[PDB]
C-alpha cells in the first residue's frame, strides 16, 4: 500500500466483479454494472508470469549427489560434509526467505502502482467533468451513454463534446 | 447524477503470504514455491529402476553373500537402496578396506 | 521430443458418455498447460477448453461449456477429457495440444493463450444412431 | 467473440511464384509490440503443425523459402518457392481471448 491507490484511499475491492484485477463501476440512467480494463490487468498478470518464470524457472541446478558415507576412521572429512550441508541449508534458507519476502512486498505494489496508474488516467482524462467525490468514484458533471463508460475504458475521450455542457451544468 | 467508479478485483480466497513489512496478508492469487508433498515411492531415477538389495548391503551384492543370492543381477541402475535393517553383509568377520569407496 | 498420443474414441450412440485421454512424453508436463481443439469432418477447427499449468483453473468454450469436463493428472503425464450429454454435432477429429506459454497463469475469463506448441495426431470421435 | 477471417478461399496458384493469403480480425489483436498471430499448416490426413508463430518469426522445421508477416488486424502469408508438397490448407487464429478462434480455412492447389 505504497502508492497509496489499494486500502488507502481506496476503502476496499468490489467482490462482485471477477472479469479482471483492476475493474471498474459504471453506473447511468439506464443502470449500473460491472466490467474490467483488459489492456491494464492483461498487462498485469504478463509481467507477473514473467516474475513467475523469472524466479522459478532461473534457479538454475545440475546433477547432485549429496549424501555422502564414511566410517568411524574419518570423522573429520564427515564433519567437513556436515559443516557444507549445513552452510548450504543456512545460505538456501536465508536467500529463499528474504528473496520471497522482497518478491511479495514488490508484487503487492505492482498491484497498488495499476491501481493507481488506472485513476491517474481516469484523472488525466475527464479533467473537469468530475467531481472526486472520494473512495476512487468519479461523479461526472454531464449525462453521457455508454460511450463514454467505454471511452475512459478505451482511451478515447472527448473533453470539447461536452465542455460546455459540463460549463453549464455547474452553477 | 451518473457515477462512475474505480476499484480491484476481490473475492475469498483464504491463501495467505507474510511480506516485510506485514505478516499474515490475504491475497486473492498465489503460487507456491515450496512443494512439501512426497508421493511415498522410490520412483525410478532416469527411468531406471533402483537395486534394491533388500535384506543386504553392497557388500552383500558384490561379495556374494548367500543370503541374497536369490536377487537378480540387473544391466544398470542409477542409484543403490538398502533398507535400515540391512545387516547381511561380510558374514565372515573382517575388514573389507575401502568399502565406502 | 515431444510425442502426444490418444486413445479412447468410437462409435458412441447421442446422450453417452465417451472418454478421451492423451499421454505426454520428452518434455516437461506440469509447467505447461494443455488444451483441446476439434475439426469438423467438413467445417473446420475450432476450440474447446484449456486447463491451467496446475490444473486449479480449468477454462471451457462458448459452445461445450456445461457438456464437456477438462481434468488432468501430472503424476501419469495423462490428459483427460470427459463428457456428459452428446449431441449430433460433436461429430469431430479431437486434438489435444500444447500452450507455448511456460507456466501460464490462465486467471480469468478473457486472458491470452499462447500459440499451441505441438499437436496430436487426432484420434477418432463420432456421434450416430 | 474475436472471429478471423481471410479473404482468399481455395487458391489456385502454380509452382515457383507468391501465393499471398490475407488475414482480417473483428478489431485490433497486437498489444505492446508483439503479434498475436500463429499460422498452421497440414496436409490431408495429417496433424497440424505450427508453422509461423507471432506472425513474423521463422521455426526448426519450417524451409527459409516461406515466412511470413503483418501488424495490426490484417496479416499475411507469402508462399516463395512453392514446392508441390506444400498442398495443403492454412489457418489463422487469434490467441488474444480465451477463445481462439480459427479461420474458415484457405487452400493452396497446384495450378
Known amino acids: 500500500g505504497l502508492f497509496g491507490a489499494i486500502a488507502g484511499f481506496i476503502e476496499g475491492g468490489w467482490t462482485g466483479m471477477v472479469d479482471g484485477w483492476y475493474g471498474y463501476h459504471h453506473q447511468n440512467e439506464q443502470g449500473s454494472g460491472y466490467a474490467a480494463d483488459l489492456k491494464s490487468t492483461q498487462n498485469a498478470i504478463d509481467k507477473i508470469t514473467n516474475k513467475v518464470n523469472s524466479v522459478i524457472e532461473k534457479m538454475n541446478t545440475q546433477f547432485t549427489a549429496v549424501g555422502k558415507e564414511f566410517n568411524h576412521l574419518e570423522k573429520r572429512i564427515e564433519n567437513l560434509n556436515k559443516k557444507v550441508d549445513d552452510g548450504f541449508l543456512d545460505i538456501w534458507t536465508y536467500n529463499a526467505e528474504l528473496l520471497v519476502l522482497l518478491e511479495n512486498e514488490r508484487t503487492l505494489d505492482y498491484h497498488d502502482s495499476n491501481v493507481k496508474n488506472l485513476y491517474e488516467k481516469v484523472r488525466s482524462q475527464l479533467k473537469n467533468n468530475a467531481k472526486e467525490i472520494g473512495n476512487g468514484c468519479f461523479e461526472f458533471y454531464h449525462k453521457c451513454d455508454n460511450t463514454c463508460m467505454e471511452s475512459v475504458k478505451n482511451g478515447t475521450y472527448d473533453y470539447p463534446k461536452y465542455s460546455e455542457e459540463a460549463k453549464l451544468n455547474r452553477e | 447524477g451518473d457515477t462512475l467508479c474505480i476499484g480491484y478485483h476481490a473475492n475469498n480466497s483464504t491463501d495467505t503470504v507474510d511480506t516485510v513489512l506485514e505478516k499474515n496478508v490475504t491475497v486473492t492469487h498465489s503460487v507456491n514455491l515450496l512443494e512439501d508433498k512426497h508421493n511415498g515411492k522410490l520412483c525410478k531415477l532416469r527411468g531406471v529402476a533402483p537395486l534394491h538389495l533388500g535384506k543386504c548391503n553392497i557388500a552383500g551384492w558384490i561379495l556374494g553373500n548367500p543370503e541374497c543370492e536369490s536377487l537378480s543381477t540387473a544391466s544398470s541402475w542409477s542409484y543403490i537402496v538398502e533398507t535400515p535393517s540391512s545387516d547381511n553383509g561380510t558374514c565372515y568377520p573382517g575388514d573389507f578396506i575401502d568399502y565406502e569407496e | 521430443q515431444v510425442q502426444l498420443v490418444q486413445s479412447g474414441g468410437g462409435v458412441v450412440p447421442p446422450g453417452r458418455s465417451l472418454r478421451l485421454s492423451c499421454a505426454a512424453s520428452g518434455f516437461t508436463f506440469s509447467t505447461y498447460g494443455m488444451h483441446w481443439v476439434r475439426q469438423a469432418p467438413g467445417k473446420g477447427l475450432e476450440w474447446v477448453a484449456v486447463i491451467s499449468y496446475d490444473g486449479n483453473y480449468k477454462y471451457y468454450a462458448d459452445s461445450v461449456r456445461g457438456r464437456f469436463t477438462i481434468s488432468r493428472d501430472n503424476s501419469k503425464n495423462t490428459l483427460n477429457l470427459d463428457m456428459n450429454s452428446l449431441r449430433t454435432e460433436d461429430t469431430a477429429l479431437y486434438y489435444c495440444?500444447?500452450?507455448?506459454?511456460?507456466?501460464?497463469?490462465?486467471?480469468?475469463?478473457?486472458?491470452?493463450?499462447?500459440?499451441?506448441?505441438?499437436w496430436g495426431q487426432g484420434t477418432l470421435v463420432t456421434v450416430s444412431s | 467473440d474475436i472471429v478471423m477471417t481471410q479473404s482468399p478461399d481455395s487458391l489456385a496458384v502454380s509452382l515457383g511464384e507468391r501465393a499471398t493469403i490475407n488475414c482480417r480480425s473483428s478489431?485490433?489483436?497486437?498489444?505492446?509490440?508483439?503479434?498475436?498471430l500463429a499460422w498452421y499448416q497440414e496436409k490431408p490426413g495429417q496433424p497440424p503443425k505450427v508453422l509461423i508463430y507471432?506472425?513474423?518469426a521463422r521455426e526448426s522445421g519450417v524451409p527459409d523459402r516461406f515466412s511470413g508477416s503483418g501488424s495490426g488486424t490484417d496479416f499475411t502469408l507469402t508462399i516463395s518457392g512453392l514446392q508441390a508438397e506444400d498442398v495443403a490448407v492454412y489457418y489463422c487464429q487469434q490467441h488474444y481471448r480465451t477463445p481462439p478462434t480459427f479461420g474458415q480455412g484457405t487452400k493452396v492447389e497446384i495450378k
Open positions: 495440444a500444447k500452450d507455448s506459454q511456460l507456466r501460464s497463469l490462465l486467471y480469468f475469463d478473457w486472458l491470452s493463450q499462447g500459440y499451441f506448441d505441438h
Open positions: 478489431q485490433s489483436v497486437s498489444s505492446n509490440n508483439k503479434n498475436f
Open positions: 507471432w506472425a513474423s
